[PDB]
Scaffold this active site. Structure first.
Site, PDB file in Angstrom:
ATOM      1  N   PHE A  18       0.786  -1.225   0.000  1.00 57.01           N
ATOM      2  CA  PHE A  18       0.000   0.000   0.000  1.00 57.01           C
ATOM      3  C   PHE A  18       0.821   1.280   0.000  1.00 57.01           C
ATOM      4  CE2 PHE A  18      -3.645   2.132  -0.488  1.00 57.01           C
ATOM      5  CZ  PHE A  18      -4.164   2.804   0.578  1.00 57.01           C
ATOM      6  N   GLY A  19       1.818   1.360   0.877  1.00 55.03           N
ATOM      7  CA  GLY A  19       2.648   2.554   0.970  1.00 55.03           C
ATOM      8  C   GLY A  19       3.484   2.692  -0.289  1.00 55.03           C
ATOM      9  N   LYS A 202     -13.954  -3.497   7.786  1.00 56.83           N
ATOM     10  CA  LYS A 202     -14.010  -4.167   6.485  1.00 56.83           C
ATOM     11  C   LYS A 202     -13.161  -5.447   6.479  1.00 56.83           C
ATOM     12  CE  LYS A 202     -10.098  -1.990   4.402  1.00 56.83           C
ATOM     13  NZ  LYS A 202      -9.422  -1.661   3.113  1.00 56.83           N
ATOM     14  N   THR A 259     -13.165  -4.942  -0.803  1.00 53.95           N
ATOM     15  CA  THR A 259     -12.434  -5.883   0.039  1.00 53.95           C
ATOM     16  C   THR A 259     -13.119  -7.248   0.230  1.00 53.95           C
ATOM     17  OG1 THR A 259     -11.358  -3.999   1.152  1.00 53.95           O
ATOM     18  CG2 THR A 259     -11.186  -6.071   2.261  1.00 53.95           C
TER      19      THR A 259
END
Ligand SMILES: CCCCCCCCCCCCCCCC(=O)O
Ligand SMILES: CCCCCCCCCCCCCCCC(=O)O
Ligand SMILES: Oc1nc(Br)nc2nc[nH]c12
Ligand SMILES: Oc1nc(Br)nc2nc[nH]c12
Lengths: 346, 346
Positions: A18-19, A202, A259
């Site tokens: 993600f980063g 989620k 998700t």
């Protein structure tokens, strides 16, 4: 304002899929972008291979992205800071290495962007709230929305939302994170809490999605799980003080729907095995977010007296050897009910 | 009340995948169930093969389901009536054959359940509204929710919502449609309008989903389409008088998320070709719901001064040879915006 902002530097703390993907966006909006990873040897490797072979395999780092294991080199000059360090190490990062970083951020009023997701077990606080014990809330924003890392890393159309107490802080971050080709589009909101609740819950709901599938259910089922699951995100959000406007938006419905249909996500696969009957002990072989989150989520809910039916049954399945089928039936033990949504228009 | 109702008879007008699937639910709650199909020869065939080889291939009709082409035999004794006849023939059915049916329904106060979906071109009215010109509104209810026909026909877990002006009418239908094994679960709501708007607009949005995919976009994109698309369902709903409580529920978000991920649905495939550049003329080879609905939907929106950005661009793509890419860019011509959702909690 509909006009973008480009910067000289950006640092991202968190070297995950993600980063790393977020650094690719920044790499197109910032002259320079450092990504902080702790293992110095790995930092060099990645930099040599021009690719994060660690967590985002198969993607070519912009040339202006440089991994570094030296916190001090990471933030010096940075005009935006992103945190994506996992929840469990967040506090410890700030205590053991954030000293100079914090002072720098405060001194130059550097905008901070929280992308970490979860609930910390000790305090049952959320990522931006933790970070807020070290940094003045006014500098803080939260990023959330449906955003599979590969898609974000390779520039495929993505919309996320950015939230800040002050909408005006969100709008300025909206102008730094949004790309020139409109491939990463940011929407502003004030619902920091709803955002963080949606992000955490989620992952738990996403194991339920797996449960459903392992149980033989299909797409009608999953759709109903997403819809009822959202009410649980909305109620927990109300109890924690949030205004709830992120709930039916990108951070909520958007990220939730995504998700839960991620059939190849570890959250799904775990639920799917539990669904097929495999004991959790047999499964675990790289933990799933929803598994770790279910426990604290359940303790927080209890402490606030919020009923979260799907999340409890998911917790029992995961932590107390409850038969998924017994769980489903109990969940349906309620009897015939009204949908329970308020009117939007009077 | 959480206690079910079983009946002696049920008729279903509409021999499609959906009505046929609905008759399988009824077949488990009603002694007898007739399904009205117009072609008498086909009626016999289906009855012989013990299977609707016409629109729900591969499914075994309960033995208590009987197809009939004689309206009069269809409703006589029926203690619930379902309409699923397509929009375009709805009015004509009532004018040319509903005479005795209407009087019977009125005389015995037989509950009517509308499952037809769309907007009638001549009047821009919705299916239950049409039917309401022939039958007293109090006898009418609407069924909507995420419900792929095959899944519903074979008993795989499905939740739908039933809406009536009077919640109490919805609750009684909730008790006739809900099955004994909790495989078809009905939730009550009053939002008849939101239900019907969601049902119609989802088919148009679902071509957009195809557009997105044919354009190279991925799952982040689709999630954002579902989320923004929903606002369009909410705004059209407000303008038409609905209270909007079905919008973020089963009939809205639920059915919307489902219908848009239906990669093998004709709505998706059409959009996907338009996405790949194939002209609409080249495509059409069995029309797609969203294609037919886009035109009237656009005229209704215009007439009510409701902005429906995604639905307009989808309409232009479908009816006015607009380049999907030109459409996307125009859609994104708005500039940096706030998410635009109201707070739930003050
Ligand atoms: C751990 C339990 C997960 C089982 C998976 C269930 C599959 C989808 C179920 C959705 C139905 C929603 C039930 C809501 C009932 C209630 O509100 O109490
Ligand atoms: C016919 C156009 C369909 C193109 C498909 C777009 C793919 C998903 C796009 C979702 C982004 C939502 C844009 C909203 C912009 C606005 O509110 O004006
Ligand atoms: O201790 C640790 N701190 C941070 Br920051 N990240 C880590 N990853 C593994 N152990 C870690
Ligand atoms: O005319 C018609 N009426 C009804 Br009801 N259904 C039909 N299907 C094709 N033509 C039809």
């Amino acid at each position: 304002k509909d006009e973008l902002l480009y910067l000289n530097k950006a640092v991202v703390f968190g070297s995950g899929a993600f980063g790393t993907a977020l650094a690719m966006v920044l790499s197109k909006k910032c002259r320079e972008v450092c990504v902080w990873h702790m293992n110095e040897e790995e930092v060099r490797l990645v930099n040599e291979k021009r690719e994060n072979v660690l967590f985002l395999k198969g993607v070519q780092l912009a040339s202006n992205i440089t991994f570094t294991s030296d916190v001090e080199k990471a933030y010096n000059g940075a005009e935006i800071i992103l945190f994506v360090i996992p929840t469990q190490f967040l506090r410890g990062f700030f205590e053991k290495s954030g000293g100079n970083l914090i002072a720098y951020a405060k001194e130059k009023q550097v905008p901070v962007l929280v992308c970490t997701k979860g609930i910390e077990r000790s305090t049952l606080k959320f990522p931006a709230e933790i970070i807020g014990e070290f940094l003045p809330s006014p500098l803080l924003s939260v990023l959330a929305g449906p955003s599979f890392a590969i898609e974000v890393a390779t520039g495929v159309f993505t919309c996320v939302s950015i939230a800040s107490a002050d909408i005006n802080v969100a709008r300025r971050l909206q102008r730094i994170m949004s790309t020139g080709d409109r491939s990463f589009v940011c929407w502003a909101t004030t619902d920091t809490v709803g955002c963080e609740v949606a992000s955490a819950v989620k992952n738990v709901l996403a194991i339920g999605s797996g449960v459903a599938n392992g149980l033989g259910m299909g797409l009608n089922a999953r759709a109903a799980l997403i819809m009822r699951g959202l009410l649980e995100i909305r109620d927990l959000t109300a109890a924690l003080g949030g205004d709830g406007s992120a709930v039916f938006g990108l951070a909520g419905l958007g990220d939730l729907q995504l998700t839960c249909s991620s059939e190849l996500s570890r959250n799904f696969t775990v639920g799917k095995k539990l669904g097929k009957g495999l004991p959790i002990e047999e499964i675990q072989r790289a933990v799933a977010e929803g598994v770790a989150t279910a426990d604290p989520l359940m303790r927080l809910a209890k402490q606030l007296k919020v009923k979260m039916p799907l999340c409890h049954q998911i917790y029992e399945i995961v932590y107390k050897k409850k038969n998924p089928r017994d769980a489903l039936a109990d969940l349906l033990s309620c009897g015939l009910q009204d949908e329970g949504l308020p009117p939007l228009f009077k």
